[model samples]
Target chain A: MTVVPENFPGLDGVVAFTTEIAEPDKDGGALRYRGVDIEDLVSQRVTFGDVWALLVDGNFGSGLPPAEPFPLPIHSGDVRVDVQAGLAMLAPIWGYAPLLDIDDATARQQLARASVMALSYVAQSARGIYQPAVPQRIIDECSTVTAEFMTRWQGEPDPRHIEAIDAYWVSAAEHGMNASTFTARVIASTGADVAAALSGAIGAMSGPLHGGAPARVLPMLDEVERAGDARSVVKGILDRGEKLMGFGHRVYRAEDPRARVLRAAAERLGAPRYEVAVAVEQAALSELRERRPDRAIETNVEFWAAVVLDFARVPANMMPAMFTCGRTAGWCAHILEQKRLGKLVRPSAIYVGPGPRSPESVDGWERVLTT
Target chain B: FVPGLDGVVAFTTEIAEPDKDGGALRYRGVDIEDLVSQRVTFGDVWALLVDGNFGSGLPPAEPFPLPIHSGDVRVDVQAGLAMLAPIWGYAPLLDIDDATARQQLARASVMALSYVAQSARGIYQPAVPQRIIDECSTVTAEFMTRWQGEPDPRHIEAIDAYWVSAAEHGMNASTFTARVIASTGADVAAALSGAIGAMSGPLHGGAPARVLPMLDEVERAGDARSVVKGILDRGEKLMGFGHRVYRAEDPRARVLRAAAERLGAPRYEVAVAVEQAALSELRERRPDRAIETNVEFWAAVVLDFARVPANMMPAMFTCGRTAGWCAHILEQKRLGKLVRPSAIYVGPGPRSPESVDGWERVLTT
Candidate 1:
């Protein structure tokens, strides 16, 4: 008889919404972006840029068009801070910008570029003069975003670094309505600006439960190596009832499809930590299966992501930043789609609190404050 | 499947929820009405929210370091906050008309504000209840100092009381967004930011500031009744007078109407003018309708006295709601699962170019 009755906490197992983007195939432990199987895409040697183009345009024909300059100043007469911190400082400034004046098409283009700019701006702020300081234009104009990111991070790319990172970027480009993407969509449902939507999404991804694992994956492998025995360390983790990172996923009952793609890169590169990572992933998966016999836990993107990124010479700290580089395009794509399918995402909740009390019985509130 | 989630139970929480039967809000077990009547500082409610205790006691708290240099005694936090504001922030700006954009920006402002405060906190505080409350207390003190620009000890106390609200009422729009993100196993920060975005919506958190503009217009347009008539003569919907959750009267509205009356600055006089002008005049215009004064009408009255900018009144809601966001996040963690719900696909594709909405209208006409 209650209007808001108790259901499942967290809305777990409830279908919140359907998406036309990547469809999670729980039956095969695979995912498809726009009806295109990723394994097929990988076989075609899809670059992160290609995947972005596909996700954003629903095809790999042409990448993002050139963007109009927003006339944002980089210097403010004060000492510049880390790029990440600097971006944090500017988020509100964007809030105050006269951005609402532009048309949606232009607004979207500007905000997508701005999202990349915010990321790049933070990178430059951390470095003095930001060697080979990649202009925000290069990020928008360049066909391959990961290549632009690599060139910006290291003065020039190693050629192989682009190939490796581009693969990682696409493989990591989009997931089915993950926290950040869902966040972007939710904000957009209210008709907020794409940039503001992205800001919300990026903030969501910043959480340890989601993007923190990327940065932690490298350290997880390092810890196993430092312990002198991969088997024992992983065994110890399971024996002590600890959850292993990069081992399992929520939707996939088996191994993640992206795992094999990154695994190939790791093997192809023969990264120094390649064997250690392989040994650890194998051991962790075995330990997980043994520990939780009822479950089908296996390798995810994080496992080989560590080996490949390390081989690409990406610093452990930059893994999450690298995630932003590829995911930004997908974030933009989803925003555009969410707007196309405009619907407010408000849901109800069970009020689990004490019933209202009569104000008079509270003794006129005199005792509550001072008496 | 639920749109606007009207009475949809999103999650369970031990933190706080709506006092539906009581027709007010509660923090743990204490009613907001009772708390307000008792004249509790936001600090007291901060204690109540975090320590789960009722009554006058400010819970034992740790000394939280300020974001700026401790020695800058004249350090204006609002100034410090303003000085810290970045130029042209936001990713590619997206969506709706002006109001939505403005609200989105306001919410983004709060997200940035929280980020800076959090980043300044360096090793960010553990998302523990005590740490969250302590940091808010510290941030509020900084916010009050900067905003009020050397506030009285009593003024700070008053401002604090107004903030610690069950404004975290039920699964509100912003709270829903926050819980949705965290329910997906995202971090509390994402939940926090996502919630801020939801709060920025014109449908919800945008109410207070929107109310201020109408009040300002009426103030300039001369007598409240005549100006309101001007608004109605143009057939405009009166803001701040109608709410979805009332029956022509609200107790909170009644209480704060008096609160503003007692604290009448020029803005209070304007609020009084509007209330007196519209109280029965508008009812005379529409006897079929029963719309009366709302909380925002009076809050606009008092906020003029708060001396904060026109844009930042909504931002304070975010500051206070941060505790609510974290509370939901912590509660979500206890559930240990994502809040994924089903939605039917009725999106782009499979429709021919001729199947556009305009063509359908063309066919109908």
Candidate 2:
């Protein structure tokens, strides 16, 4: 019943599998986590830890594990790459931990916690702080991820920033089978542990095509803030035929629903560049609408993600890792789902290199044969 | 198309594919059986896959000496290699000179071998090989020398065939994992490390290690046919007997069986008897399909003759399969398109958070 196009390089429109997790509605711009609207989740003030549980299990705010941070082996320059290495290193150890024999719920809870801890440790290291002490109060008093990370990385957490980041996290948690989520599912389909699958997903996240754009969004906002003329700067970018970063998405035709959720959070937190960002977003959308009437080019989540993450005190370089921090919950959930499917995600490829070559036509054939 | 995406062409590739009906595998359009019959080195097949010609002579021109440390990571070489892979010899594949890219891939072989051999022995050895790697022609000889002080000529010849045969297959889970990572423009190390995680799964490289227990049970029961029947009665899969892609006998299994016989591996005859019994019993039960032995059956005996422990089987597979992973990573990076597929959302229809009972209580202090 499936007719796959020949040489479908990026699998642009292929439906690989059915998912019951978060659904990103391309037509309506309504992102749903098991049917709950993103706007509703943001308004109700759901925490990332709770959303994590909701995605992995069925109930919200149930069984959010304690934050257990460990010392990382080494910190490379980029926190994203460092987390990639750290997660892969921790997989084997975690698989053998007495924790492996524990029930799946606890193990998954721990996997989500471990992923956040890895991100927090490396994010701190990128600030030139080596082996920072974990705050016991945050670990004991706070079970949510935003409070824990904000407390450990900084001296303590601010309630407003925590609330804002939580909304952002819940929005960023899951979005259908994106590249990194698909990578995690592919790894999990092999019967690998949760940590192992997340590690592979981390690698995919390091790709600039996926996780690298949020950082660029902040720089573009800065570029417009300095120019003092939003329309002129937006027009100049369009004149150069460059894509206005964070303005368009592959899946979304309408405005990204997560962008609206984060836009409110960014405004409530009073981001220093919030006024300039709003102006640039307005100008860019107007320019896009006027330039290309045939297409619907709308603002994606990365635009406001930059504002929210920037207000949360995350640097531009570490934006991708912070995004990964939230998406880890979704990746873990998808891994569990794919593991239950019990079929390997093995896809074949159309061979386009060369036809069968006769031995006599090849240069080193006889030399290799004689040896 | 469906759950497994079976028979769906994920992408177009120049790497490798299997001819299921003809029972042959090809790398860069050259038959693997012919390569084995010609006694080609692992390097030759790797060169063919990566560069589309033999004798490319890619070099570990200067090996990086890894820092040897003490830890319990020696327990699983699969995890150990994946952990240490990105730590050492990592460089982004995009925008680098072709020389540097190929050189980094060559260095990965050194890192994997050094790490795997040290973990297998559960002791720290010099991270740098005692002998010059350039002098060692085949990866098998180099690995055996690093593993033990001396290389067994017979074991080297036998394992070289196994490594060459095991190098590349089309779009397997691990290779696809590598390509998926590479599609994102990740570094060579990150992509290769990710593939190792996939290979560690029990359904992939982890399957070959289980072949030993089946062989042992056959030897212990003293009747291959009855043991095969007993496993079938329990509704258990006979691990090495059949394959998902082949209707005929696995070509690599045929190649490795000959290599095992040549080495006079200890369990060769028993493995042969077990294969006969399994084929006979499975063909009788199915009657509509051909049930034949796969490579893991002889691969276990061949690896055992090479003195590899059961736990290290997947790690050894990683060491040999890195060639294919590297080749596919380079190809995917060249293609430069992210492999993102669509998903059908089967969740409840979109609704507001207020629609759920007790949704307002989600706020936490």
Candidate 3:
């Protein structure tokens, strides 16, 4: 267990994972589900649903029910159906509607209305106030909402597409407690409400340092692909001591298994260009491995998964939506587990500011009490 | 006498109506009841308050095509997207960089807004065929073009319904703050920033943030009744239960409930039961008269019913109230007054002897 340090910036010592990071090698790269790598899952499964199941419930084939004998019937017949459904479901839930339409009215007006309505809707929906309950009911509701919203707004029935998107969400459902999950866990430890804790998690994830990075990778890869020399671009990025998007792992020291799975899926999808990008990424990974065996950085699942999903025509903006859908399972699982544990996560903060300092010295310090 | 603070002149000339009982809130001499009862969209309220007219604009045109513009400048939709990206990402992940998320979100907001403004015109042009207009209005294709992503278009109704329901509410803290800020001669942006800042506070905007956890807590406790009892026993304030304003009942709660019903939300009954139970418990306890189901409770129930995660609740509120805040700011700018409240200072007397022993003696007292 990581010992939580007091007054740590970025909450460095906050240990959200009582469970070990799933696939931690001696070098510190952690696995996501069971022992399977994120890359393997991404490459093998074109839809995020498969990976989501793996992360939340463990390896799908291990003990879970087998995949259907045939390809699951596509509902709306859109190849990218699952992606669209996920986007639609995640959008309004996240209160993106107003932000997405801020210019039409005024910022304050749009934000205020969206905030209230979204919260109200979410509260009702999550509590099962409106529709029938099913297994993974929230996810189903989200998918349905996404489908309905898309159909109404887009003027086309995309149920078939959304069915595919639902599958992707199922795949994206769970993973080992990630940074945001850990944050949620930390907040939960304080006996805060799950929503409040989750809010904290969302706040943390909103930062580019976490979930935003994956979405940004596509544009970065686009830059590399457009440059005509993915290898050179990789090397130049490395030379500048810059972190490559979708490359390397924080916990996985060796190869990323998810990359393999996602690569396989991309191959199945018949995106040869994407394969080339993956290959170049792998080459760069190999070079990095050879250059710094000690660092143990490897191409992680996000890198390959990002390429596959992007090539699948998933919008770059939808990357995080995919991540959110996939991660919801993990978040829910964590919530359940934390509830089971029944321990409030209260970590102490060490005060490090000036000791015994007079308030008069502080600039912009105003003290007033309102009744 | 200060030039910058010169706007802080006291008005002793007119007393329109003294709120001796603290019930005199109004918008341009019109009660909030009249506004809500009239079913005025927030836009109409804005026009009335700021522009001083009730029916100045075109009849509440069918949810004006999104991405509407202010003039030559397109509102930044990218900023909305950027803002949304990190917020959405953070929903399931924490420890994400807040600054980075804020920056991206700012960008996304701009971009999304721009797209909506552009798209609105496309939806509103009259020469366009009705079918084409309907198609454009319902076009899932447009989302892909504007957001450059494929999302299930089916959610449009739900999104629209949510937008309509979320369009307006009575003067709450953030709105009140906006009015106060507007009362000061600040520009719309400044007033909005102040309101947004206020809304960012955990106390003001914290209700929605607390709802999910409260629900989970109740669920974890196994029985809702027991959970309420336990909360009351522990003296832990129950979230999503009562309101500070709204005596007897919150009007928005019913409005939200009606909307949830229209949406056929599944979680409606469970949320209602929870509310009912909490209200019963509060009535039994009778701690204060303010212990009734307020808009937050219903807001939480509605949002939860929509399956929106708990943390995103405040952001949703921010999005919904943005228009109101802007309107208030504009009105305040027009009214032209500075907001500076006086405080009664209670501390050590000026120029008192500052000996350590004296300070220690004072501290001991």
Best by lDDT: 2
Fnat of all models, as shown:
0.35, 0.68, 0.00
RMSD of each candidate relative to the true structure: 9.9, 3.8, 21.7
Q: Per-residue CA lDDT of candidate 1, range B1-365, in tens?
A: 54433445566565665544545556775677676666665544543553345443333222333343322111112122222323323221211233332333334334334433333333434422343344434334544443333455444433444465424555666776776665555433335555655565554534566676677787567777787787778987787775435443555566556655554454667777787877667678777766667766655555546654455566555655655655555556556665555444333433222232222211100
**Ranked by lDDT, top first:** 2, 1, 3
Angstrom error of the Cα, residue B327, model 1: value is 4.2
Candidate number with greatest TM-score: 2
The docking category that best describes candidate 2 is medium
* Residue-level lDDT tens digits of model 2 in A270-295: 77888998999899889988987887
The 10-residue segment with the lowest total lDDT in model 3 chain B: B11-20
Error of 3 at B145 (Å): 44
lDDT of 3 by residue, B1-365 (tens): 11111222222111011121343323444444444444444434433433334443112123223322222111122112223322234221122233332232233222333344343334334332233333433222232223223233333333333333343343434544444433423223323333443354343433565666667776556568877788789887887776554435554555667656666767676676778788889877887666667567667766666444554455456544554444444433333444323211121221212221222221100
lDDT for B348 (candidate 2) = 82
- TM-score of candidate 1's A chain against the true A chain: 0.78
Q: How well does candidate 2 score on lDDT at residue A348? A: 79
lDDT of 3: 0.41
lDDT of each: 0.55, 0.72, 0.41
Best by DockQ: 2
Clashes of 2: 0
- Candidate 2, clashing residue pairs? none
Worst 10 residues of 2 chain B by lDDT: B66-75
